[PDB]
């Protein structure tokens, strides 16, 4: 008459402690009917009365299986002793391990998304990752990886990784996490972009390779906008300008500094806002509909330096070699792009 429908989870550490959840039918009436009749093979599973749902759910903590001479076992539930139910599938006792952390280094401020690779890392009912004794904020996990977020470090250098899965304490001295000095930002070249953004900016600083996915951010017109970067080496990365296009306002022809300009690099929050930055945003080009002469304004920057918009006229999906004046775009071939700007 009693029947088990599902077990969750299906694997657990051999040391025990797993909170097994047994869902079924006719699972007794009161907690006394099943308080002593739940076993995982030879191992006792102690039910928790607070999470016992009458005739439907039995939550029990699995005991120690360190001396059990078996790898998996069926779950037996005895109601009161004749009428008992056997689990449809088997519960597996495993020994979780890990062999790699990626990335193995990151800023001292923390905020680095790390994935610890190993075996049986999805076993049990809870998990807790620690680096140097501080909690790595758990995000998710499967059988081969645990994704968590590093905490701020005490001092730069290596730090041990310890994982807790119920009563199992996983360690590996060959797998450490190296806290590095926080990256710094020195200059942005060129120090300007257009309203639609999307232009390539060369950012130079220190320890840039210690952050896997740095981003660039700008606050303008009451709106925050972001864009992606790619690190080339510890002192040089390339970003795309955030687009500040919004219906509240647009930059003037002479340019205006954004309310904020900065970078998102893990939890190095001092880089979020560059206060003394003179970065300017300029208007988008204003074009209008056998050489072709596309006329318009805001084509060249009002500040003549070493840089100018890298235009591309994709007529026929083929770039044309072009000469650019203040009011001239010239194609010489037998749809207009500039960073994130596009117009025909
Ligand atoms: C941590 O990384 C730095 C380079 O950023 C390196 O010089 C140092 O040796 C590393 N520490 C360990 C323990 O690997
Ligand atoms: C990084 O690459 C840039 C581009 O050539 C170069 O100018 C710079 O010196 C490099 N920095 C290091 C630390 O290698
Ligand atoms: C300008 O755009 C063209 C077309 O994509 C590209 O080949 C070229 O490298 C770009 N130049 C610069 C300086 O970004």
Numbering used by the authors: 861 to 940, 944 to 1152, 1165 to 1209, 1218 to 1227
Copied sentences from the primary study:
Plexins are large type 1 transmembrane proteins comprising typically ten domains in their extracellular segment, a single membrane spanning region that is predicted to be helical and a conserved, cytoplasmic region that contains a GTPase-activating protein (GAP) domain with a Rho GTPase-binding domain insert. All our PlxnA ectodomain structures show autoinhibitory, intermolecular “head-to-stalk” (domain 1 to domain 4-5) interactions, which are confirmed by biophysical assays, live cell fluorescence microscopy, and cell-based and neuronal growth cone collapse assays.
Possibly this distinctive orientation is stabilized by a loop (1,175–1,184) extending from IPT6 that provides hydrophobic interactions with three residues in domain IPT5, Trp1055, Ile1057, and Tyr1145, which are conserved across the A class Plxns. The interface between PSI3 and IPT3 (domains 6 and 7) differs markedly from those of PSI1-IPT1 and PSI2-IPT2, imposing a more acute angle on the relative arrangement of these two domains, and thus reducing the ring circumference.
